[PDB]
Design an enzyme around this catalytic site. Structure first.
Site, mmCIF file in Angstrom:
data_model
loop_
_atom_site.group_PDB
_atom_site.id
_atom_site.type_symbol
_atom_site.label_atom_id
_atom_site.label_comp_id
_atom_site.label_asym_id
_atom_site.label_seq_id
_atom_site.Cartn_x
_atom_site.Cartn_y
_atom_site.Cartn_z
ATOM 1 N N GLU A 69 0.908 -1.145 0.000
ATOM 2 C CA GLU A 69 0.000 0.000 0.000
ATOM 3 C C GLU A 69 0.954 1.204 0.000
ATOM 4 O O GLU A 69 1.906 1.220 0.774
ATOM 5 C CB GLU A 69 -0.853 -0.006 1.276
ATOM 6 C CG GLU A 69 -1.803 1.183 1.377
ATOM 7 C CD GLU A 69 -2.560 1.258 2.694
ATOM 8 O OE1 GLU A 69 -2.024 0.808 3.728
ATOM 9 O OE2 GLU A 69 -3.691 1.789 2.697
ATOM 10 N N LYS A 85 4.947 0.380 9.848
ATOM 11 C CA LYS A 85 5.013 1.633 9.087
ATOM 12 C C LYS A 85 4.462 2.764 9.936
ATOM 13 O O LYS A 85 4.811 3.916 9.726
ATOM 14 C CB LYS A 85 4.176 1.583 7.802
ATOM 15 C CG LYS A 85 4.721 0.735 6.672
ATOM 16 C CD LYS A 85 4.304 1.329 5.320
ATOM 17 C CE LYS A 85 4.035 0.257 4.274
ATOM 18 N NZ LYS A 85 2.772 -0.474 4.605
ATOM 19 N N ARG A 105 5.694 -13.023 9.183
ATOM 20 C CA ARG A 105 6.376 -11.783 8.846
ATOM 21 C C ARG A 105 7.706 -11.691 9.618
ATOM 22 O O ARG A 105 7.867 -12.286 10.689
ATOM 23 C CB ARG A 105 5.477 -10.580 9.172
ATOM 24 C CG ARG A 105 5.239 -10.317 10.649
ATOM 25 C CD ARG A 105 4.074 -9.393 10.803
ATOM 26 N NE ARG A 105 4.380 -8.079 10.250
ATOM 27 C CZ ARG A 105 3.590 -7.379 9.433
ATOM 28 N NH1 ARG A 105 2.411 -7.855 9.041
ATOM 29 N NH2 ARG A 105 3.986 -6.178 9.016
#
Ligand SMILES: Nc1ncnc2c1ncn2[C@@H]1O[C@H](COP(=O)(O)O)[C@@H](O)[C@H]1O
Length: 529
Positions: free
Chosen positions: A27, A263, A253
């Site tokens: 994104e 983020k 992850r």
RNA sequence: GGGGUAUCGCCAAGCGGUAAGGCACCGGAUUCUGAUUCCGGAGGUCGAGGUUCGAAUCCUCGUACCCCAGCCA
């Protein structure tokens, strides 16, 4: 090989597939980081190994969280890492008209309805992890009412929050995402690609499977939090006229010790100015690791080494470091610098200096040699000289010798300090002919090099888990040491990384090294036991 | 409730055949980088059972940890 590649093989054999086509969908709501490098390697690597294709898709179904600056960067690091995407760069926004048409198919098909419950209300009617949810009072409007109401939303008739399109699934499903998840929500904001053409935007789950399908993705790879979400991924596709059904596979992850990957947290460090930019050398971003002096090749090696599994893991810094080391150790040429200088003065030396031949890489003579200026007024790093102490201390003692780097074996025989008992100079005598060990830089031809020492950003291995991760930053993550390095470094170029002997591996850049002040970044120090 | 995961310090293989591989740690050999390189060592299969000649792999009861109640992705 890993579990995902084994699944890929099984399918290729079973003829379920004749080719693999993966994708990387960030994104554009921030810069890419080491975690994205793991995902980029998995997806792009798999494709290349399997002579397939991999797309770069910017999942941009949320105009308010993303900016164009990010798409610009994401593309940059993806390439810098050594990966090329298939065909043009994609965007969920490209499918914004397809998605609308699909929401309408669901509606006609009776699988979606414009709900009018407020945002607080949809949560209240949603159930809980243990107690089931309940049907909205607007759940059973007619296809005509829903079609009419959807367009109303699209046209802008409804205020944000005042209405949303929901999937009519099962409000008591043990899978909380199947409790009539929202498909479209109202956002009167401008999109960085579609301008103000759309006042309604699609949710992730709705957009992801459809994009994947349209592009012809064979294997949709993602992290573990989307395991439950896969139920809605298959439901959407199963319930619309689409000719393919991409299969999702989740892997754990990356989690890195002493650092944060979110983020949101990374953004905060950048927002609140606790670090220069997303590219600050202490950031675990790709541009950060790059500016710090990591080689794309060392990152790909890192990702290769860490594996791909479904187990939550947390790699130690040591591993990331071993990687840049194993690279730079073999490709970087040695140089000579002194981070914390103390002027030595061989009174025994006469002349205005001379020149000594030095190698470019001790275990690789074919990298050539060089000429460096010697003198009786050279510099050294304080820590090298010691007035006393131990039988292991292999450096300078107030009554012994040491081989200066590629030069003469000096031998201290005096010293001097100041009002605060701090030394200023060390008087020693160079053996006329000799050409522990130490490293130096002659004061005459000593370039004033600003050296930047970097350390772990955080003081605790798992800063994320801290109540206030910010309050746990390491005040010594960046220690700026003014020093002196050989005139050779007068010809450094951002991109080139040399190994300042005995210290670490350094590189120029850092966004500061002007023509006057050659600022240098310490990529990684050596193993120092 | 539901979805997942449990192999040394950290990662992570062998998928019924008997504990790879990388990183960390600990020792020894060289090196004008205490680096590099080089040998040597320590430690591990959640627990309790079942099946089997044999199980890390299959079966089961436990337990531990992670994810899910955004009109975020
Ligand atoms: N910490 C992480 N570890 C591994 N993959 C990650 C991580 N963060 C993001 N990704 C991958 O990057 C994709 C795009 O992320 P976004 O920009 O949130 C995700 O769908 C994941 O596949």
């Amino acid at each position: 090989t890993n579990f995902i590649r084994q699944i890929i093989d099984e399918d290729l054999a079973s003829g379920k597939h004749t080719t693999v086509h993966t994708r990387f969908p960030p994104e554009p709501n921030g810069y890419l980081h080491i975690g994205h490098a793991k995902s980029i390697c998995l997806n792009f690597g798999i494709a290349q190994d399997y002579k397939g294709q991999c797309n770069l898709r910017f999942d941009d179904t949320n105009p308010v969280k993303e900016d164009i600056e990010y798409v610009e960067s994401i593309k940059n690091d993806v390439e810098w890492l050594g990966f090329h995407w298939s065909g043009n760069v994609r965007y969920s926004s490209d499918y914004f008209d397809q998605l609308h048409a699909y929401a309408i198919e669901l509606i006609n098909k009776g699988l979606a309805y414009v709900d009018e419950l407020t945002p607080e209300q949809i949560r209240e009617y949603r159930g809980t992890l243990t107690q089931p949810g309940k049907n909205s009072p607007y759940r059973d409007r007619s296809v005509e009412e829903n079609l009419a109401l959807f367009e109303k939303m699209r046209a802008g008739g409804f205020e944000e929050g005042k209405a949303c399109l929901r999937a009519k699934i099962d409000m008591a499903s043990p899978f909380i995402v199947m409790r009539d998840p929202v498909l479209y929500r109202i956002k009167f904001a401008e999109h960085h690609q579609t301008g103000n053409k759309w006042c309604i935007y699609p949710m992730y789950d709705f957009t992801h499977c459809i994009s994947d399908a349209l592009e012809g993705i064979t294997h949709s790879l993602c992290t573990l939090e989307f395991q439950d979400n896969r139920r809605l991924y298959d439901w959407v596709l199963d319930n619309i006229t689409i000719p393919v059904h991409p299969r999702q596979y989740e892997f754990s992850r990356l989690n890195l010790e002493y650092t944060v990957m979110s983020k949101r947290k990374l953004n905060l460090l950048v927002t609140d100015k606790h670090v220069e930019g997303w590219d600050d050398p202490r950031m675990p971003t790709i541009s950060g690791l790059r500016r710090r002096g990591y080689t794309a090749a060392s990152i790909r090696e890192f990702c290769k080494r860490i594996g791909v599994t479904k187990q939550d893991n947390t790699i130690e810094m040591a591993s990331l470091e071993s990687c840049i080391r194993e690279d730079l150790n073999e490709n970087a040429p040695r140089a000579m610098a002194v981070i914390d200088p103390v002027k030595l003065v061989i009174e025994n030396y006469q002349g205005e200096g001379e020149m000594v031949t030095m190698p470019n890489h001790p275990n690789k003579p074919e990298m050539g040699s060089r000429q460096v200026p010697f003198s009786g007024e050279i510099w050294i790093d304080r820590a090298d000289f010691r007035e006393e102490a131990n039988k292991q201390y292999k450096r300078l003692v107030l009554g012994k010798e040491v081989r200066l780097r590629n030069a003469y074996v000096i031998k201290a025989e005096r010293v001097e300090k100041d009002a605060e008992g701090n030394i200023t100079t060390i008087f020693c005598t160079y053996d006329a002919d000799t050409l522990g060990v130490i490293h130096w830089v002659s004061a005459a031809h000593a370039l004033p090099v600003e050296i930047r020492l970097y350390d772990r950003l955080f003081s605790v291995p798992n800063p994320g888990a801290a109540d206030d991760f910010l309050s746990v930053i390491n005040p010594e993550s960046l220690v700026i040491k003014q020093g002196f390095a050989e005139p050779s470094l007068k010809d450094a170029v951002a991109g080139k990384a040399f190994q300042f002997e005995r210290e670490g591996y350094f590189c120029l850049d850092s966004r500061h090294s002007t023509a006057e002040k050659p600022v240098f970044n310490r990529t990684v120090g050596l193993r120092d036991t």
